[PDB]
Ligand binder design. Structure first.
Ligand code: MG
Ligand code: MG
Ligand code: MG
Ligand code: ZN
Lengths: 108, 173, 166, 152, 287
């Protein structure tokens, strides 16, 4: 089934400039209090999450280094310690992960 | 100055401040009318970009009023023959003058200075000429800024000096 | 090709008289040869047409389209050069006056069909054009009130003449 | 019509769906925090809690062991489930996992989600937090609460 | 006549502002370092007395302009439209902060002053209305209040529900006006000149000057209305969203004169409450 006639620019404009076709303005956008970058509500802030993910990756690299090879998951809990930190009574009997940097403010 | 005179055969130090003043004023005047052809004759190739590059896409209303103190030569130096067939002579002149300056935008909105009110200014201006080269003339080469110089008049615009833009992994100090 | 949009920032107006309202700063900026349809680009251009700079950047940041990040880049460049070169007071104090997509130079390729027959495929390119104007974004035109309609109708009635007479 | 259909159709079919979820779950047990498409994460979440329940049921239990053997492809994780994860949650009766929406994926613009097991060693997520009690609206309501309790 | 009094007050205010503006040593520059969690270590090189914290926000983003209610300058509260004086550290305080106590107080005071303006203009010409003060009542109390002395004619008069609605509508009109909260920092003598007619204002200015080491007092204007304030105010009138004048109470020790306490409750656009929650807040504010 082929078009019987060429559709005009007038009719085409009516189709493609319809509100239905148009991009809708978003009202979800707020400033993240932590970093000041824009976040959509209901969604984790991209900047803050990227920061957390970078740190998580570093810790995981260290975890892999200590484990050595595959199929070496520990049968005890894990704890991450930074520079100038010692294991506590709770941290005793846990796997210790050492980081070469200082504690982040957000990490508690 | 003996090294300059031997090439020139006819040079007067006593007359030079008057010439220097004329060159200076004419160069600064042609900035207003944006005649680069005349500027090239009056201004050294080193000096040209220094006084031209920022002036692009904006209007200057520089003017000269009476000088408080007559200009005088302070230092005379010459080249040490770095290039064959090239000798350069430099004269430094002290100028204590009153001047008016108004700088505007593309859009004609005033950026800097006030049109009517004159301001006192003390400047060291060094002039360079290429000797051993015919058709050569004394041209404004550089302005020396003293370390003890008073700060320039403040701009009308308020500016923001941005802090260090940091990647997520980076931590502020 | 033509590149008139670039030359628009090269206009110098004469200095304003003291007894004159302050002229709003205008900034012209475009990206040429974006690998993207002009038709697709149009929607994003239309979206940010009346908006302030910050509003526009926000909307573009959370848009899923490819062209959104390209417009964001162009807007940021324009905001930067506005403050630096065009003597805009505040980076926030800008709004989009013009936001347009245009066709770019394109390439013809062959698209093989399921016989000896074929089709001609066209690699689309577009330009994005933006004009920023210093100042708060102008208020949107208010919807016509009943009183406005009424007034217009009375005006129509009062305007009418005895036609085809002395 | 799909009234009261509780499971999504994903992968190459029913078996493939199980296998996809199994891989996500294995990832979660190992890493304790997993990024994946939102729908897949939401589907896997239920299985995550159920696995902890079987972990609690006991190491010695053969039924729980069989389930754990199936759902964990990497076998080293099976001790971890029984000896680390299950003892951790012994206090609480549920809500072992935490799921949060993440900015859309770069390539395919997919809705994304992070899932973690609670009480992990990893750096804390930028969780959404309710407004402080010291805000104006909260102050007014605290006043109201005080007045009501004084009335009684 | 009230019209001539407000006219005269405006003239004096404008004269004082012009005087303060004239003594500026030709657009001097001050360095203002931004100390915040967001966008750290940014410096503003700005005018000595022309520039305001709002123009600092204008340098940053629209978001700062929209959300920032007060500026903390050297750890001291500061109006958004209050001109800066010296090189200082600035941060911006919003309603959403961990301790928005200062913002709460500022909003409370601002609403009190708005109500004052409304009730001044509300009454008929024949009747006499005299504004006493805005007491520093906590937000936890549930209602911002203002003390007013009325004429002897309306001693037996008690406002109706419709009257309270009318005050509310006038307040909403004032919100719709979108008037900035203009501020002025003056010597006591100037304030005495402005507020010579109202004895209550005289007394309040006297005590405010007394508590200060100098005789420095603060004045605020919305639109043709001038009032002496306890502290800093919110930037703009448009900040208020939900604004109702709750009730009027006669103060018990009415031996010398009868003082009406006007009570109302408000919430900003940022912290909009639902219809139901709002109704609860109203029923409390009437007490
Ligand atoms: Mg073939
Ligand atoms: Mg369904
Ligand atoms: Mg599928
Ligand atoms: Zn953030």
């Amino acid at each position: 089934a082929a078009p019987k006639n060429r559709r005009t620019i007038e009719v085409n404009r009516c189709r493609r400039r319809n509100p239905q076709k148009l991009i809708k303005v978003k009202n979800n956008i707020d400033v993240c209090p932590e970093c000041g970058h824009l976040k959509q509500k209901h969604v984790l802030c991209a900047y803050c999450y990227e920061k957390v993910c970078k740190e998580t990756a570093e810790i995981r690299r260290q975890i892999g280094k200590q484990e050595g090879g595959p199929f070496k998951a520990p049968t005890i809990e894990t704890v991450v310690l930074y520079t100038g930190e010692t294991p506590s009574e709770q941290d005793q009997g846990k796997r210790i992960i050492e980081r070469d940097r200082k504690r982040p403010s957000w990490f508690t | 100055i003996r090294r300059i005179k031997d090439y020139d055969a006819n040079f007067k130090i006593k007359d030079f401040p008057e010439k220097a003043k004329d060159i200076f004023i004419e160069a600064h005047l042609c900035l207003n009318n944006s005649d680069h052809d005349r500027l090239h004759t009056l201004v050294t190739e080193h000096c040209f970009p220094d006084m031209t590059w920022d002036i692009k896409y904006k209007t200057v209303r520089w003017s000269f009023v009476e000088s408080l103190e007559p200009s005088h030569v302070v230092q005379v130096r010459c080249s040490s023959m770095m290039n064959q067939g090239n000798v350069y002579g430099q004269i430094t002149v002290r100028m204590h003058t009153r001047q008016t300056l108004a700088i505007y935008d593309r859009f004609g909105r005033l950026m800097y200075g006030q049109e009517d009110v004159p301001k006192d200014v003390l400047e060291y201006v060094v002039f360079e000429k290429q000797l051993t080269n015919p058709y050569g003339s004394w041209r404004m080469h550089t302005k020396i800024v003293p370390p003890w110089a008073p700060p320039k008049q403040p701009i009308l615009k308020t500016v923001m000096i941005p802090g260090p833009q940091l990647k997520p992994e980076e931590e502020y100090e | 090709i033509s590149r008139k949009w670039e030359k628009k920032n090269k206009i110098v107006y004469p200095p304003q008289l003291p007894g004159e309202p302050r002229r709003p700063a205008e900034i012209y900026h475009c990206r040429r040869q974006i690998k993207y349809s002009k038709d697709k680009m149009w929607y994003l251009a239309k979206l940010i047409r009346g908006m302030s700079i910050d509003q526009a950047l926000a909307q573009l940041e959370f848009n899923d389209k490819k062209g959104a990040k390209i417009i964001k880049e162009v807007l940021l460049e324009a905001q930067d050069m506005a403050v630096r070169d065009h003597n805009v007071e505040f980076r926030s104090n800008l709004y989009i006056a013009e936001s347009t997509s245009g066709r770019g130079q394109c390439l013809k390729r062959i698209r093989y069909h399921g016989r000896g027959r074929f089709g001609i495929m066209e690699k689309v390119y577009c330009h994005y054009f933006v004009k920023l104007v210093e100042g708060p974004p102008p208020p949107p035109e208010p919807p016509k009130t009943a009183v406005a309609h009424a007034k217009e109708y009375i005006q129509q009635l009062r305007s009418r003449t005895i036609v085809h007479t002395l | 019509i799909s009234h009261g259909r509780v499971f999504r159709r994903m992968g190459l079919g029913p078996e493939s769906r199980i296998h996809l979820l199994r891989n996500l779950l294995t990832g979660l047990v190992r890493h304790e925090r997993i990024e994946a498409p939102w729908a897949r994460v939401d589907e896997m979440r239920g299985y995550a809690e159920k696995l902890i329940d079987y972990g609690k049921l006991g190491d010695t239990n053969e039924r729980a062991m069989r389930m754990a053997d199936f759902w964990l492809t990497e076998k080293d994780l099976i001790p971890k489930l029984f000896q680390v994860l299950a003892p951790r949650y012994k206090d609480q009766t549920g809500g072992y996992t935490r799921m949060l929406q993440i900015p859309n994926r770069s390539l395919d613009r997919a809705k994304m989600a992070v899932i973690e097991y609670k009480g992990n060693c990893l750096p804390p997520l930028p969780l959404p937090r309710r407004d402080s009690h010291l805000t104006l609206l909260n102050q007014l309501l605290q006043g109201l609460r005080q007045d009501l309790r004084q009335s009684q | 006549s009230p019209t001539e009094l407000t006219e005269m007050r405006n003239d004096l205010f404008n004269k004082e502002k012009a005087r303060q503006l004239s003594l500026t040593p030709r657009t001097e520059k001050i360095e203002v370092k931004h100390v915040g969690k967001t966008d750290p270590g940014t410096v503003f090189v700005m005018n000595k007395n022309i520039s305001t914290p709002y123009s600092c926000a204008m340098h940053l983003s629209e978001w700062y302009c929209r959300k920032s209610i007060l500026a903390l300058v050297d750890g001291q509260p500061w109006d958004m439209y209050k001109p800066l004086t010296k090189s200082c550290e600035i941060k911006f305080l919003t309603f959403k902060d961990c301790d928005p106590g200062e913002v709460n107080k500022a909003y409370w005071r601002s609403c009190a002053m708005m109500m004052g303006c409304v009730i001044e203009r509300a009454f008929k010409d024949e009747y006499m209305v005299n504004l006493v003060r805005a007491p520093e009542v906590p937000v936890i109390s549930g209602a911002f209040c203002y003390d007013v002395v009325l004429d002897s004619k309306l001693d037996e008069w008690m406002p109706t529900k419709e009257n309270l609605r009318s005050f509310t509508k006038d307040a909403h009109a004032l919100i719709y006006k979108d008037l900035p909260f203009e501020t002025l920092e003056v010597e006591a003598k100037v304030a005495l000149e402005i507020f010579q007619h109202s004895k209550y204002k005289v007394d309040f200015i006297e005590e405010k000057a007394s508590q200060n080491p100098e005789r420095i007092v603060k004045l605020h204007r919305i639109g043709d209305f001038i009032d002496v304030s306890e502290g800093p105010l919110i930037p703009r009138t448009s900040i208020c969203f939900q604004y109702e004048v709750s009730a009027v109470h006669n103060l018990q020790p009415t031996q010398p004169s009868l003082i009406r306490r006007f009570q109302g409750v408000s919430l900003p656009v940022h912290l909009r409450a639902h219809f139901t929650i709002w109704d609860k807040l109203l029923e409390r504010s009437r007490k």
